[PDB]
Known about the structure:
Elements: H1 4-17, H2 21-35, H3 37-41, H4 52-57, H5 59-76, H6 83-96, H7 101-118, H8 125-149
Helix pairs in contact: 1-8, 2-5, 2-7, 6-8, 7-8
Amino acid sequence: VLSEGEWQLVLHVWAKVEADVAGHGQDILIRLFKSHPETLEKFDRFKHLKTEAEMKASEDLKKQGVTVLTALGAILKKKGHHEAELKPLAQSHATKHKIPIKYLEFISEAIIHVLHSRHPGNFGADAQGAMNKALELFRKDIAAKYKELGY
């Protein structure tokens, strides 16, 4: 469980991401796809993208970044009471998209990298620790639903 103080650090930084959800989404997805190319392969919609400049130029990539960041924003703002949010996300990612839990780790690292890049003064080590705890809690609860479904 996160403390109230940890939730605060998390949501203070997230309120900043929310000033430019599109920009953050693009940076995070590009980070993820460059750092972990296997992840790009899960997206039929992006597998034609072969360079960072192609990725940066993709309007659909930006749009999908807003999708992922909007769903995550909603989960974070539940401060751990995110059962209603995770159930559908767990079902589709396990059974339809085939996303290993390890890839949720990868996107967490990309999120942390970018937040650090864009918000140094509001994302010191304390806020980074809180963000990684929140993202781990998310992964933990998703993993439990994966294990239930046999994935």
